Symmetry: C4
Subunit: 206 residues, 4 copies
């Protein structure tokens, strides 16, 4: 749990994200909680050229390491960390099904019991704000108060968890739920969902 | 047909399942009939870290090997084995098209002649029950009385056959039929199907 | 252009077909014109275990080599060869989009100028008949009189050309046209098409 | 920035295009600005057999190197270069989602903020004309006056940028926007879009 070990795992997560077909447009950024701030992917540099020394450290004040440019979305990574003290890793991407649901400005309801992996009976959709602004950060902070993942309207997805492996797994599961939702919504609306009682049982079971 | 040979084939089936794009969310579990019970994948451990000694033996009583945790869905694997004496292998996954049809709570009708590979003119959909419960097991046992594969409402798919190779092949074919069904259902409802007479001819031919 | 060279190319075409995502369910079969009949893939044997000596020779009478089982669909390969003297290779598969259009029992109209690669302004759909019957063969023979590719209702696709490389390429293009057609049909029906005049110009240009 | 270095990058872009799933039907062609004209992919030769010496030089007059056949679509590559002096590379393909939107004859509106990567609030659709004609070239030239990418009705996509890496990236992003658009259009029409004000802010921000 030295910086370089953590930097490699961020890079592995970027590669795995592309392998899984979640990083379309090379839009993602990945971060981990570190010291008083976080380690995050840099802006510009394509994922396949990424090396350990490219990873940027941003402190609690928002001051980033000299000579390195953090992702343009670093601020809502910091907002997730402040809003969810238990989160140690954050994954952001523009997975197509998630982003399509975020264009409809819909929450994903409990169409499958795995919806409870994000903490409740839904995956919310935070209202649009211009990328990189404080206003976007506030909407994300509010949406993550009681959920580990959120859609961002007209934009994409943020998922947070205790480590990169779970954060990536969660992100992937939300993309499956989004695809399931869009496929059934094209047939019938509304889509059959599981009741709050049933989801309370599953949550207790998890 | 020693335990280790069977354990390797289970692991190969998990890998092949992911290769085929049926194991989305890393939700599957695979088992084979063995001695008085079965060998099944363990809970927790990601598929790529899976080794022969991770595979768990569960006897006829439901007692599992000391120090190993069987999949959380072991019970409906045991229900399939008791309901279908001819089954020697069972594959479960959350393939997206199958799961989407299971959310509509629909059976897949005879939209293609390959529907007869599961034993009749349809692929049923068993009613939802909380994962891991006896009630889920009963619905699965009933649905598999005269079919080798079934959807599970709000959940996924179970397919069983005489060996892992056929069980995987069947699972894959049901996922193709599910995709075919959802694609045509978005255009027209109902979907044209083949008649019972035609399917009786194909069954006789198989 | 010895038998073994031709047998390798058939096997390569099976692999390439799977690479392209056209061979879903391991449903395809591939043949080439040879001597007085054809060389075709065998029934049963999965594609990845396929070796040169597995390829079966079937003569003009329909008598196949001793000790080898030709694909269960050999008859409509022979029907294509008799109907289209210019065809030297035939590819059959159950590509999902093609098969979904074949379930609607629709012809694919001229939604794109590449429709002319199959010889006219459409890709027809031959009426269903039980697999392996003479009746299926007659429908295929009629549909291929003035087209190099046809859908088969409730079944899949047949594409024929001057060599395996073009036959595979054609099969792939029809699968793209099928996907294009289904995607736009879910939005609007009918789908805008190019006129007969325009297609006559493109045909002249090819 | 010798010819051979540029020829390798064209070939790498063809391979990458196929990797990304944008080159379906082996329909693409790629060019770069060079000397008084351009280097472009040849007609006929499949991408995987492509070697540096296959790449064709076409001058400003349209005269191509002796003994080599340029892509059949070279003319609208030349039209892009004359219309957009800043473009140094041009990518053309028949990506399925783009082509499906081009069959509807629709422009893609601002359903996502990444729409501004092509220069405005939309991705236009140029009216159909027979491939390889001067009339097709004029429509492309007009559509690219204030956009870096355009759909071509009943045909596919053209994307242009300052280098091959950005041109490919742009092409890929337009394919994601096309898929997003088609997925949401099947659910609701019209699709929610971002306002002109919002897009002006994002453009200023880029
Ligand atoms: Zn983003
Ligand atoms: Zn399950
Ligand atoms: Zn077939
Ligand atoms: Zn083209």
């Amino acid at each position: 749990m030295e910086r370089n070990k953590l930097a490699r795992q961020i890079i592995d997560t970027c590669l795995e994200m592309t392998r899984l077909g979640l990083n379309q447009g090379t839009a993602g950024n990945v971060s981990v909680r570190y010291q008083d701030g976080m380690l995050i992917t840099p802006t510009g540099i394509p994922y396949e050229k990424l090396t350990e020394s490219h990873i940027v450290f941003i402190d609690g004040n928002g001051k980033h390491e000299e000579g390195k440019l953090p992702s343009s979305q670093w601020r809502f990574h910091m907002a997730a960390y402040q809003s969810r003290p238990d989160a140690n890793a954050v994954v952001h991407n523009h997975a197509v099904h998630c982003t399509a649901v975020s264009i409809l400005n819909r929450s994903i309801p409990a169409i499958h019991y795995m919806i409870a992996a994000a903490g409740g009976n839904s995956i919310p959709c935070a209202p649009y704000a211009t990328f990189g602004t404080r206003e976007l950060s506030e909407h994300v902070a509010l949406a993550l108060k009681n959920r580990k993942a959120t859609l961002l309207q007209h934009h994409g997805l943020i998922a947070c968890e205790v480590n990169l492996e779970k954060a990536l797994w969660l992100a992937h599961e939300v993309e499956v739920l989004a695809q399931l939702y869009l496929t059934t919504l094209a047939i019938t609306d509304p889509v059959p969902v599981l009741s709050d009682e049933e989801i309370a049982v599953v949550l207790e079971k998890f």
